Amino acid sequence: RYEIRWRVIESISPDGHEYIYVDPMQLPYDSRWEFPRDGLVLGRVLGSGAFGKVVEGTAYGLSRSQPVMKVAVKMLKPTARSSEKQALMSELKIMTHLGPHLNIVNLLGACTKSGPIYIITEYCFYGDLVNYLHKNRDSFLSHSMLDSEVKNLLSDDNSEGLTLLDLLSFTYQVARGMEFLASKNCVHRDLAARNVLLAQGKIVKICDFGLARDIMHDSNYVSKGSTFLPVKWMAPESIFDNLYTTLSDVWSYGILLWEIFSLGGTPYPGMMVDSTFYNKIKSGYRMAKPDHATSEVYEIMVKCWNSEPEKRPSFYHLSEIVENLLPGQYKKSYEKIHLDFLKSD
């Protein structure tokens, strides 16, 4: 029972109370992704889950830009239920269908022929945002101008105490990653700081890292109908009407920003998901401003949490809003890094 959460919308009825998602099994596997298994050496486990694991690795000759390249490798357990094996190929097909973006964990290649299915993806040095914000909590100082040279350092591996600028950078980058997925009509459905990784250069990449987690040991998921749901991140219409769209992704984005600007805090602190939680959300309960959010940032969270989905801002517009909260130089740096990424290989 392992499947990627992400869905791509193929059509909507004219009303439209009916979404049709692509069946990923119906998509093609471009065999040009295939990479020789002997070009790949596996190393330390990054995370292990109920159905498989993600492992650190080195790929030789996979990339022209980096002939010796650190990667992350997604794989199933040997027990390998067959439907699961298809699920993994489906994830592969979806990633090929979406194409690449700076701010997602990108597909780099696959081993699908003789042996267990491997998906080869970008490796993210700093791991997920939750743990990263935790580890750097004590070092956080608040203090936003290009002249300082603080702005130049942000999108680099240089070492300094965590700052509001960093938090805004993470915010901007998740918005650009989600603007990309939204432009492909891809609905994430599990957007949360745990599904945001941080890579070399402090580049945030959105992913689904569920394969590396045991859902049954994860308190952030609540059982429903034989499934477990990230309830504290879910829009009301997903909770009550089972409706998942880009607009419910925007709701999750607001929850994610709360995670960010509370330095890795758990949403709805001290509030367990139970009958009185659902009633409160339904009745319009929203979180108060986290300690390190500016007023402009909390205003963004509040907008994402509109009870009326169509009144929530688009990820394109969120990107613009956050861009104006950042120094002009930062957008300049991002553009250069965007271009370098696209030129890679």
Curated annotation (Swiss-Prot):
Q: Look up what happens after changing residue 21 to F.
A: Abolishes interaction with SRC-family members and impairs internalization of the activated receptor
Upon changing residue 214 to Y, the result is: In a GIST sample; imatinib sensitive, constitutively activated kinase
Query: Which residues does the entry place in the Cytoplasmic compartment?
Result: 1-345
What is the tissue specificity? Detected in platelets (at protein level). Widely expressed. Detected in brain, fibroblasts, smooth muscle, heart, and embryo. Expressed in primary and metastatic colon tumors and in normal colon tissue.
What's the effect of swapping residue 221 to S? In a hypereosinophilic syndrome sample; constitutively activated kinase
Q: Domain of life here?
A: Eukaryota
Entry binding sites for ATP: 46-54, 74
Site positions per UniProt: Breakpoint for interstitial deletion to form the FIP1L1-PDGFRA fusion protein:
25-26
Its subcellular locations are: Cell membrane; Cell projection, Cilium; Golgi apparatus
Which sequence positions carry the modification called Phosphotyrosine? Answer: 19, 21, 221
Q: What post-translational changes are documented for it?
A: N-glycosylated. Ubiquitinated, leading to its internalization and degradation.
Active-site annotation: 190 (proton acceptor)
* Impact upon substituting residue 214 to V: In a GIST sample; imatinib resistant, constitutively activated kinase
Protein kinase domain sequence ranges = 40-326
Q: What does this protein do?
A: Tyrosine-protein kinase that acts as a cell-surface receptor for PDGFA, PDGFB and PDGFC and plays an essential role in the regulation of embryonic development, cell proliferation, survival and chemotaxis. Depending on the context, promotes or inhibits cell proliferation and cell migration. Plays an important role in the differentiation of bone marrow-derived mesenchymal stem cells. Required for normal skeleton development and cephalic closure during embryonic development.
The text of the family note is:
Belongs to the protein kinase superfamily. Tyr protein kinase family. CSF-1/PDGF receptor subfamily.
Which medical condition is this protein associated with?
A chromosomal aberration involving PDGFRA is found in some cases of hypereosinophilic syndrome. Interstitial chromosomal deletion del(4)(q12q12) causes the fusion of FIP1L1 and PDGFRA (FIP1L1-PDGFRA). Mutations that cause overexpression and/or constitutive activation of PDGFRA may be a cause of hypereosinophilic syndrome.
Q: What quaternary arrangement does the UniProt entry report?
A: Interacts with homodimeric PDGFA, PDGFB and PDGFC, and with heterodimers formed by PDGFA and PDGFB. Monomer in the absence of bound ligand. Interaction with dimeric PDGFA, PDGFB and/or PDGFC leads to receptor dimerization, where both PDGFRA homodimers and heterodimers with PDGFRB are observed. Interacts (tyrosine phosphorylated) with SHB (via SH2 domain). Interacts (tyrosine phosphorylated) with SHF (via SH2 domain). Interacts (tyrosine phosphorylated) with SRC (via SH2 domain). Interacts (tyrosine phosphorylated) with PIK3R1. Interacts (tyrosine phosphorylated) with PLCG1 (via SH2 domain). (Microbial infection) Interacts with human cytomegalovirus/HHV-5 envelope glycoprotein B/gB. Also interacts with the trimeric complex gH-gL-gO. Trimer-PDGFRA interaction has an inhibitory effect on PDGFRA signaling.
What name does the UniProt record give this protein?
Answer: Platelet-derived growth factor receptor alpha
Lineage start: Eukaryota, Metazoa, Chordata, Craniata, Vertebrata
Gene that this polypeptide is encoded by: PDGFRA
Instruction: List the range of the whole protein covered here.
Output: 554 to 973 of 1089
